[PDB]
Nucleic acid binder design. Sequence first.
RNA 1: CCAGGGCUACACACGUGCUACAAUGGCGCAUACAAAGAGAAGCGACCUCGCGAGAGCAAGCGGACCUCAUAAAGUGCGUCGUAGUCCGGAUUGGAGUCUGCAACUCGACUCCAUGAAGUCGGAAUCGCUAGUAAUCGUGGAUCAGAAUGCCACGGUGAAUAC
Lengths: 80, 114, 66, 152, 177
Amino acid sequence: MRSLKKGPFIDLHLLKKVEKAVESGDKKPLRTWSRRSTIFPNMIGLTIAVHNGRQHVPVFVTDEMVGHKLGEFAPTRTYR
Amino acid sequence: ARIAGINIPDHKHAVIALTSIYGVGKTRSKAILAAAGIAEDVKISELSEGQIDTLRDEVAKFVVEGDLRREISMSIKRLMDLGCYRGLRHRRGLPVRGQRTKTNARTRKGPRKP
Amino acid sequence: MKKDIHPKYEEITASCSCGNVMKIRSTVGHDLNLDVCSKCHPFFTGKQRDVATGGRVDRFNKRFNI
Amino acid sequence: NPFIRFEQDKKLFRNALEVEGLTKGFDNGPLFKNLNLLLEVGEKLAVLGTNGVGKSTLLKTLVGDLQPDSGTVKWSENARIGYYAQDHEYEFENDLTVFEWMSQWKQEGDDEQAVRSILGRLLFSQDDIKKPAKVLSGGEKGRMLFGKLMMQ
Amino acid sequence: AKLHDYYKDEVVKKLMTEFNYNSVMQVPRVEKITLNMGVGEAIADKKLLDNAAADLAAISGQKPLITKARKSVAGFKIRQGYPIGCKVTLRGERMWEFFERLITIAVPRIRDFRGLSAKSFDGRGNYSMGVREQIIFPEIDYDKVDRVRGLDITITTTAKSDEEGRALLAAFDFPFR
RNA sequence: CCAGGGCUACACACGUGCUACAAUGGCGCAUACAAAGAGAAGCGACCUCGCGAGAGCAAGCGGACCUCAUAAAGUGCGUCGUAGUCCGGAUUGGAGUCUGCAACUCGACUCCAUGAAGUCGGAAUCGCUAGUAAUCGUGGAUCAGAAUGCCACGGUGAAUAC
Ligand SMILES: Nc1ncnc2c1ncn2[C@@H]1O[C@H](COP(=O)(O)OP(=O)(O)OP(=O)(O)O)[C@@H](O)[C@H]1O
Ligand SMILES: [Mg+2]
Ligand SMILES: [Mg+2]
Ligand SMILES: [Mg+2]
Ligand SMILES: [Mg+2]
């Protein structure tokens, strides 16, 4: 999926989960363990929560964050 | 002669004189000269103004010194203020392509300071 | 004035790339041609066209070939 | 004792100069004919002449006093040259005071403090800072020329 | 001059109708334009003050007056009498000519043009403006320049109100917001 | 047993290496000469496409025949004339290709632009006596993808041992 010939990637569990959310709009933050999935423009305005390894941190979506994969916005290792 | 920002170097081959433009390297400098009808071996000094005139407009098809630095700074600013990973690496002055910082990365971190 | 202590001031005809002949006095002595003056400046469209960079939504959609 | 200390600005490498073609004479004939030498960086030359063999006009040519037969005199690229000609009279044929005369070459970063400390280091006093330039002795003028060689 | 006759021809009528005056000598008019640069540091390089005065004289064809420190303020290591800046006051023909040849070609040359603010008033109808650099005038040719010294321009008019001072410069096609 | 993360963290220090700091070299064109070794959910010609990594159809071969696979230093011609340089290639922005459920943490590679330190390295210290050191390239194991390491092959080929 890291090629235009294949197409942008999102997991099936996340894809069906976000579809239900937009059917009713913004709601309680979405907890997900998926970090390998790109960010689609269908979930702009949500506060999905990615799991960095120990906790779920809420990442706020924005038009700018529409080509970056989900895990980019959860620092997995702490430092100072 | 005088191109978009400035073209100081005479006495150099034209193909390697336009490389002093922030946005023109070697493969584009080769292309521009062929597009304008000027060979590569010919020195810039020998070029009469009937040639450099077309050179001052050919470079307008590539983003160059006048705007290239503004876009790159804007490009970096977008990631830095985003909060993503590559913004964080820029913020701390550390490698952003995901490589070793345990021993190497003197270029990114800076001179060896205790 | 005070008897030749100022730089020389004479009439020059500085024109723009868009024509724009003006009769002015300046301490240059050599005619000057420059960019567009306020006579034809894009002071109403030069700002409305400045906002062009931004928005990856359409970039993502144009990459939606699949 | 004058605390003279000469410091380089931007050091260079490989050849300092290359001179070929050297031939020149005024009345008697060519003092030196086809002189070839090459100087690596850091070299020290001691070109002594004994009263009238071109011992000074060769240096004048090297620093620039044109129309020799030599067509291949060449300097290094980033070269900055300091010159001490044996005639200090012409550089002081002027009514400039000592300090302001020294201030013809304050480089970008040097101030009143630096331009005056470079002569205070030479045990010149602000007592003497107000005197015209052409009134100094031979040794005093020579040392002021060092105060000018420091700046460049 | 050109802008002077433009004023006396049409701006008088414009402002008279816009402010229901009754006498010709009641309309606000520009009285002087004073452009100065405070070089800040000349104690270090006494000649940099000379170069700044030369830049100002090139910008406006009048030999600048070198304005010296008033009181020995201790913050920046200056004392009474030190030359601090240079200033030029332009009146009449030179005033009008510089005003015209600024507003026509010098203003548009500022990088990232925006239009000068409308709140740059002292409260008595006198305008002030910066440039942030002097290269934007056609009188500097990239040869002797070492610094990016700028100007500070105050257009002082006989306007007695901030609104009148707004309207006077608005009627001259000023690049406002 | 499973999902995610860490083993890749970075004020620093040490060890083993690759690349260089250039003119007995850089780049462009043209062109000679190897040895050894691998291959069946494997090696993949030909032709077409793409600036390129590569994509498409797709012969041949479980092999002294088919593929990897055009060897490179060299030679002939041209330019660069000692510059942080037509040396150096890190770092970074953008655009991509291939494996692979999946490439952000954390893959390799390609295109454009940017061009850092470096101009022969303090005390000290290592290897080598002949097809040796030095220098230049190819192969294999591991392996879906991923070595400047490891293992092996050849080309050019020294100085010195009182
Ligand atoms: N312009 C000139 N006209 C005539 N003769 C000249 C000229 N310049 C030099 N000479 C003569 O040529 C010779 C060159 O002497 P030069 O000027 O080198 O002096 P020197 O005695 O060698 O050294 P120094 O000047 O350092 O004391 C002398 O005989 C001098 O008289
Ligand atoms: Mg697991
Ligand atoms: Mg490990
Ligand atoms: Mg350096
Ligand atoms: Mg492998």
